[PDB]
Curated annotation (Swiss-Prot):
<keyword id="KW-0793">Thylakoid</keyword>
<feature type="binding site">
    <location>
        <position position="72"/>
    </location>
    <ligand>
        <name>NADP(+)</name>
    </ligand>
</feature>
<keyword id="KW-0560">Oxidoreductase</keyword>
<keyword id="KW-0605">Phycobilisome</keyword>
<keyword id="KW-0285">Flavoprotein</keyword>
<dbReference type="GO" id="GO:0004324">
    <property type="term" value="F:ferredoxin-NADP+ reductase activity"/>
</dbReference>
<feature type="binding site">
    <location>
        <begin position="225"/>
        <end position="229"/>
    </location>
    <ligand>
        <name>NADP(+)</name>
    </ligand>
</feature>
<feature type="binding site">
    <location>
        <begin position="215"/>
        <end position="216"/>
    </location>
    <ligand>
        <name>NADP(+)</name>
    </ligand>
</feature>
<keyword id="KW-0472">Membrane</keyword>
<dbReference type="GO" id="GO:0031676">
    <property type="term" value="C:plasma membrane-derived thylakoid membrane"/>
</dbReference>
<dbReference type="GO" id="GO:0050661">
    <property type="term" value="F:NADP binding"/>
</dbReference>
<dbReference type="GO" id="GO:0050660">
    <property type="term" value="F:flavin adenine dinucleotide binding"/>
</dbReference>
<feature type="binding site">
    <location>
        <begin position="108"/>
        <end position="110"/>
    </location>
    <ligand>
        <name>FAD</name>
    </ligand>
</feature>
<feature type="binding site">
    <location>
        <position position="149"/>
    </location>
    <ligand>
        <name>NADP(+)</name>
    </ligand>
</feature>
<feature type="binding site">
    <location>
        <position position="92"/>
    </location>
    <ligand>
        <name>NADP(+)</name>
    </ligand>
</feature>
<keyword id="KW-0521">NADP</keyword>
<keyword id="KW-0274">FAD</keyword>
Amino acid sequence: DVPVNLYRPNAPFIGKVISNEPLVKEGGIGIVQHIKFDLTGGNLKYIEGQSIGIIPPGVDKNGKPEKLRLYSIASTRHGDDVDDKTISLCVRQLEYKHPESGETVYGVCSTYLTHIEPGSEVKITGPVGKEMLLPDDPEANVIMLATGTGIAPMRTYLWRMFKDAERAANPEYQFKGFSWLVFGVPTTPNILYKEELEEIQQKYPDNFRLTYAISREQKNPQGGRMYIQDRVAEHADELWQLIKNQKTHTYICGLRGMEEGIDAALSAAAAKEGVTWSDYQKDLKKAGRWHVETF
Ligand SMILES: Cc1cc2nc3c(=O)[nH]c(=O)nc-3n(C[C@H](O)[C@H](O)[C@H](O)COP(=O)(O)OP(=O)(O)OC[C@H]3O[C@@H](n4cnc5c(N)ncnc54)[C@H](O)[C@@H]3O)c2cc1C
């Protein structure tokens, strides 16, 4: 049912870049690009919450061909133009410290992607993943906890739930539950898809709540920079109350590091009702209602 591995690294799909557009506004930190690829001429199909591989050109330091890197799909199954002809990624250029030979170091696949020109051919594999899938139940509640490019699967969910053209294209999924995105980035310019996310909340105030953790602009009650775990702590009781619903699904995506604080917050909330969160969570995971993709 769920499409997987329609293309594999040994014979990847050769897609063409359609567009490569910046998502970080001026005054933001780093580079994050929205890259749309043409799928025509191949049979790559995918659904929300899946990933694809990109095989960058060139050899590694040892002279071996570069292997694929996985990227969360950022578009619904229909693509950004709701035409079933494209796929989009949300790619941060990896950039880091002196402590790794030279000065600034640039990630191979992410630099390739963020600097790629429209018209260029790209080697695409996949799709991959069954752990971040959205329920077909239109009355499900969906909690989304994202940092940085972790927004990508959330965008696929929210566009499917809330975009006019998606609703028109998906007769069987007219979302009427409650979705809550807690999104952590360093700056307001770094709020990926800010305008569209805010448009959704304005349009669907009873079906979508948008919460930001903006680390360079907000402080947690301890005086530290605000991160998503601080927002989870702040709204722990409400989040736990929602999680108790048989139809609630939670999705976590982004760089590793926040799950521990998220667990501590939810544990304190659940303990008030004599529930051990770690146990409840194990059962949620088994039932397919606790979805984590951290990298
Ligand atoms: C399921 C999944 C989904 C993903 N989705 C996305 C996505 O949507 N968007 C996105 O941008 N990325 C995503 N990634 C990460 C992506 O796959 C790549 O790992 C990332 O883009 C960097 O790859 P690269 O080739 O540019 O860097 P590489 O050239 O492969 O370098 C990576 C290496 O650099 C070193 N390194 C990395 N960070 C540091 C640091 N801070 N300090 C010191 N050394 C460091 C580590 O040794 C690491 O092995 C996802 C990963 C997975 C597994």
